[PDB]
C-alpha cells in the first residue's frame, strides 16, 4: 500500500525540503509497506492553467492530500483558491501553509480545506486579551468593508457578547478609498479613546495619515492593529506608539512544510489502520464522483495532536484553522518595532522593554475621555420638574421659598406647547424642582457643568414596532439617551427590566410604587372586580409610552385591562389628572409619588389601594458609563446624611 502526497510550492527548492520532510516522516513512521511518496509542482501565473495543472499533475495521481504554499509576490487570496476548488470537488483535503485570508475558513465554499496558520480574524482574540489585561471597555472598531474586515468585526463582536459588552461604534470604510477623514471625525466625537483597526496595508497608510492630520495620534489615544498594518507602506506612515502583533513563524515556509507533512503522515497512518479506505479518483477527467473516504480522512486530520512540530503544537479547531498560535506584540518606539510581549495562545506576558503609548506617555492611558459639558434631557413632571415661561428679558424670576431661601432654577430649552400651536422652536423656559435640585447638587459634587433640555415628544419611552420596519426602537427620553441627543436622564425614570437591558441605572434616589387616583375611595386596587371586568361604564387609563404601559403589556393575566387602557390612554400625567377631575376619566393608574402629591395638593381626589408595583426612580445613563459608579455613590451619600429628606420636605411634603 503506497500513499502519495502532492504539493504546490513556489521556489522549486521548497520542493526539495518537502521531499526531505516526507523522507523523514517515512523513516520515523515505520515504512514497512506504507511508502509515503511525494510529488510536487510549482505555482503558475494564470489561475485557470494552475487549476488544470492541479488536475493533470496531482489529482491524476492517487493523491491523498495536497499542500499549498504562497508565492513571495503578494497576490492575497488569488493563488491558493484554484487548488481549493479542484481538490474540493473530490473532498481531497488541501492544507494551506501560509495563507491567512478568512474566506478559506468557510467550509461551505472551501469544503476540504485546512490550514496550519490562523487567519487574520483570530487577531481579534489576542486583542480581546489586551482588553482584559488593561481593562479597556469603550473601544472603536475601524474595519474595512471587504470580507476580511467583516470577519474580524464579527469575531470580535462574538467575543464581546460572551463578556456581555459592546463596541462604542463600528466604522466600515470602502477599500482603496481616499479621504476617510469624515468617518474619523465621528471617532473623534466619541468618548472612547481606543481604536482597533483592521484593514489592508494601503488602507492602513491612508487611515494613519488622516488620523495624523486630525490629531488622533496624541496622548490618551490607543491604537491596536494587526500585522497587515505594521508592514510595508503602512509601517512608514504608522504613528509612533501603536501596538501591532506578528505571528512568530508566519512566513517560515520550511517549518510549515515539515509540520504539515508530519500531521499528514500521522493522519494517513491512522486512516490506513481504520480500514475501508477506498482509493482517490485518479484523474479529474472521467471521474465525476467524490472520494468516499474524503470526509473521513478530513475528520481524522482535524482530530490530530502533533505535539512535535517546529512551530509548536499542531492542532486544528472546528473549521481547520490552527488553534493555539503564538503572537508577538510589537510597539513602534522611535520608528523601530520593539517586541514588548508574547501572546502564548491564552495570555499575553510582558517580558522586556517599556510600552510607549502614542502620546509618548509612560503610563497606561484610560480608554475614555469623559467630557465636562453634559446634555441632560428631562421631562415635565409636576412635583419633580416644574417648567414655567421665562420673563421677557430672558432670565428666571427671582423667587424665595416659604421658609425664606432662594429657589435654584435652570434654563431649559423645550417645545412651546403642543405640536400644532407650537412655532416649532426650542424656546428657553425655566425648570426647577426636586430633580433640578438633585442635579445641581450632583453636578457640584462630581464637578461637571451641564445644559438642560426637555424631551422633544414628551414621552418617557417604550419600544414600539412601526409597520414595515426591520426592528423596534425606543422613543421619548430612552430614545434620546440611546441616540446620543442626551448624556444623562435626570427625571422620575422608573427602573425596570426592559429599560435596564439598554440603559445603566443609578441606585434609586426615590422609592415608590404604582397607585390609582379617583375622584372624591371605592376601589380595592387592581384586584377589584370592576377593574378585571371592564365595561364602557368604567373607563381607566394611564399615560402613553410609560413604565405603566410596559408593566401592563408584559402580563398575560392583565391583558384585557391592558386592551381597555390602551383604547383610552392619555398623552401626559397632567392631562389625565385634569380629565379625572373633569369627570371624564374614572381611575388613573400612575406613580405613587406623583399621584400622592397631586391628591394632597389639589384635594378633591384620593388614592386607592396598595402599591402593586414597587420600584424606584434612578438616573439613567448610557451602558457602561464611566461615572455610573460616581453617580451611584453620590446618591447613596445624599440618602445617608440628610439631603434626600431635605428635598422631600422642601418639594413634596
Amino acid at each position: 500500500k503506497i500513499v502519495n502526497i502532492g504539493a504546490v510550492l513556489s521556489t522549486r527548492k521548497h520542493e526539495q525540503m518537502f521531499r526531505e520532510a516526507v523522507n523523514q516522516a517515512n523513516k520515523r513512521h515505520g515504512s514497512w509497506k506504507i511508502q509515503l511518496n511525494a510529488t510536487s509542482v510549482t505555482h503558475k501565473p494564470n489561475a485557470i492553467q494552475m487549476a488544470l495543472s492541479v488536475c493533470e499533475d496531482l489529482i491524476s495521481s492517487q493523491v491523498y492530500a495536497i499542500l499549498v504554499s504562497h508565492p513571495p509576490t503578494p497576490n492575497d487570496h488569488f493563488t491558493p483558491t484554484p487548488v481549493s476548488y479542484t481538490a474540493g470537488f473530490y473532498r481531497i483535503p488541501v492544507l494551506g501553509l501560509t495563507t491567512r485570508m478568512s474566506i478559506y475558513s468557510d467550509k461551505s465554499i472551501h469544503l476540504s480545506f485546512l490550514r496550519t496558520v490562523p487567519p487574520y480574524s483570530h487577531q481579534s482574540s489576542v486583542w480581546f486579551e489586551m482588553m482584559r489585561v488593561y481593562n479597556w471597555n469603550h473601544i472603536i472598531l475601524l474595519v474595512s468593508d471587504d470580507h476580511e474586515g467583516r470577519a474580524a468585526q464579527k469575531r470580535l463582536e462574538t467575543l464581546l457578547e460572551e463578556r456581555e459588552s459592546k463596541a462604542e461604534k463600528v466604522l466600515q470604510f470602502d477599500p482603496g478609498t481616499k479621504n476617510v477623514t469624515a468617518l474619523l471625525m465621528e471617532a473623534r466625537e466619541l468618548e472612547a479613546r481606543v481604536i482597533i483597526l483592521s484593514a489592508s496595508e494601503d488602507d492602513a497608510a491612508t487611515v494613519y495619515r488622516a488620523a495624523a492630520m486630525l490629531n488622533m495620534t496624541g496622548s490618551g489615544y490607543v491604537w491596536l492593529v494587526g500585522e497587515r498594518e505594521i508592514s510595508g507602506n503602512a509601517l512608514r506612515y504608522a504613528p509612533d506608539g501603536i501596538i501591532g502583533l506578528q505571528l512568530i513563524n508566519g512566513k517560515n515556509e520550511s517549518a510549515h512544510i515539515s509540520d504539515a507533512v508530519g500531521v499528514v503522515a500521522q493522519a494517513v497512518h491512522e486512516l490506513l489502520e481504520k480500514e475501508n479506505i477506498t482509493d482517490p479518483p485518479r484523474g479529474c477527467v472521467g471521474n465525476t464522483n467524490i472520494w468516499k473516504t474524503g470526509p473521513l480522512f478530513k475528520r481524522v486530520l482535524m482530530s490530530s495532536k502533533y505535539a512535535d512540530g517546529v512551530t509548536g503544537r499542531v492542532e486544528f479547531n472546528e473549521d481547520g484553522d490552527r488553534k493555539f498560535a503564538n503572537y508577538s506584540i510589537m510597539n513602534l518606539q522611535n520608528r523601530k518595532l520593539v517586541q514588548v510581549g508574547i501572546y502564548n495562545g491564552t495570555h499575553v506576558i510582558p517580558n522586556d522593554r517599556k510600552i510607549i503609548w502614542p502620546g509618548g506617555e509612560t503610563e497606561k492611558p484610560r480608554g475614555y475621555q469623559m467630557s465636562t459639558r453634559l446634555k441632560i434631557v428631562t421631562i415635565h413632571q409636576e412635583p419633580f420638574v416644574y417648567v414655567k415661561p421665562t420673563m421677557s428679558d430672558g432670565t428666571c424670576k427671582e423667587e424665595f421659598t416659604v421658609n425664606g431661601d432662594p429657589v435654584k432654577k435652570v434654563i431649559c430649552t423645550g417645545p412651546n406647547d403642543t405640536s400644532p400651536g407650537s412655532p416649532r422652536h426650542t424656546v428657553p423656559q425655566c425648570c426647577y424642582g426636586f430633580c433640578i435640585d438633585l442635579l445641581i447638587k450632583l453636578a457640584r459634587t462630581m464637578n461637571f457643568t451641564y445644559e438642560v433640555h426637555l424631551v422633544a415628544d414628551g414621552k418617557f419611552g417604550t419600544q414600539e414596532r412601526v409597520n414595515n420596519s426591520n426592528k423596534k426602537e425606543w422613543n421619548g427620553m430612552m430614545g434620546e439617551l440611546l441616540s446620543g441627543q442626551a448624556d444623562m436622564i435626570v427625571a422620575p425614570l422608573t427602573i425596570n427590566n426592559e429599560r435596564a437591558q439598554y440603559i445603566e441605572f443609578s441606585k434609586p434616589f426615590k422609592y415608590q410604587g404604582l397607585t390609582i387616583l379617583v375622584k372624591k375611595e371605592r376601589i380595592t386596587g387592581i384586584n377589584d372586580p370592576r377593574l378585571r371586568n371592564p365595561s364602557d361604564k368604567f373607563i381607566y387609563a394611564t399615560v402613553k409610552q410609560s413604565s405603566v404601559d410596559i408593566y401592563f403589556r408584559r402580563q398575560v393575566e392583565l391583558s384585557t385591562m391592558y386592551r381597555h387602557m390602551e383604547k383610552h390612554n392619555y398623552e401626559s400625567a397632567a392631562e389625565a389628572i385634569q380629565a379625572v377631575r373633569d369627570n371624564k376619566l374614572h381611575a388613573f393608574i400612575w406613580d405613587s409619588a406623583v399621584l400622592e402629591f397631586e391628591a394632597s395638593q389639589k384635594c378633591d381626589l384620593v388614592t386607592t389601594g396598595e402599591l402593586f408595583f414597587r420600584s424606584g426612580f434612578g438616573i439613567g445613563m448610557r451602558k457602561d458609563s464611566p461615572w455610573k459608579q460616581n453617580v451611584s455613590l453620590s446618591i447613596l451619600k445624599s440618602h445617608e446624611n440628610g439631603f434626600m429628606e431635605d428635598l422631600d420636605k422642601t418639594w413634596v411634603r
Partner: protein
Amino acid sequence: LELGPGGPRARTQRLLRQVDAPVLVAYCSREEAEVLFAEAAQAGLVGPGHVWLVPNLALGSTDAPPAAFPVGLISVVTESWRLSLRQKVRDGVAILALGAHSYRRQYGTLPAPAGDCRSHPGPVSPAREAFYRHLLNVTWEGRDFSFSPGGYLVRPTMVVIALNRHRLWEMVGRWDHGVLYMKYPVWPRYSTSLQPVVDS
C-alpha cells in the same frame, strides 16, 4: 444530529428518542434527509401530530421523491419548480437578452463580449460593471428577476409545496408581494402511521 453513509448510527437514535415537539424543522441534504427520516420513523416521529418543514436542500429531483419521505412534508421552492428545462433555458436567455437591450438602449451600443482564458485584465472595466448593473434588475413576462448584490434573487414569487397522499409534490401555498395565500384553512393530517394510535 449526524447523518451520512453508515456512520455512527447510535446516539442519533437516542437523541431522536427525546424529541418532544409537534412541529419539526430539519436541515440536511438529500441523502442525509433519507437517513434522518428512516431514523425518525424508527423512532416514531412521523404521522399525525408531527409536522416537518424542510428547505429545498433536502429535496432532490422533485419529480420522484423517496419512499422514506413522510406525507405532509412541507418545503418552499421558486415558481419555476414545475417548469421544464426548455422553459428555464428560455427564461435565462430572456434575462440576458433583456439586460443587453436595456444596456444598449441606455448607452447606445451593444455590450462588449467577454474575454478569454488568457491573461486577465485585473481591474474591472466600467463597461463590464455597467452591463452587470443593467443585468441585475430585469423583469420578464410579469414576474421579475431582480437579482441581489449577492447574486441570488430578491423578492421572487415563492411556492409552498407539500407531499400529498399519492406521494406527489403538490402546491399548497403561494407567496407574492409578502402575502401568504394558503389553499387549506386547516392543515390536513391524513398520514397513515396510526399503528401505535398514541403517535397521534
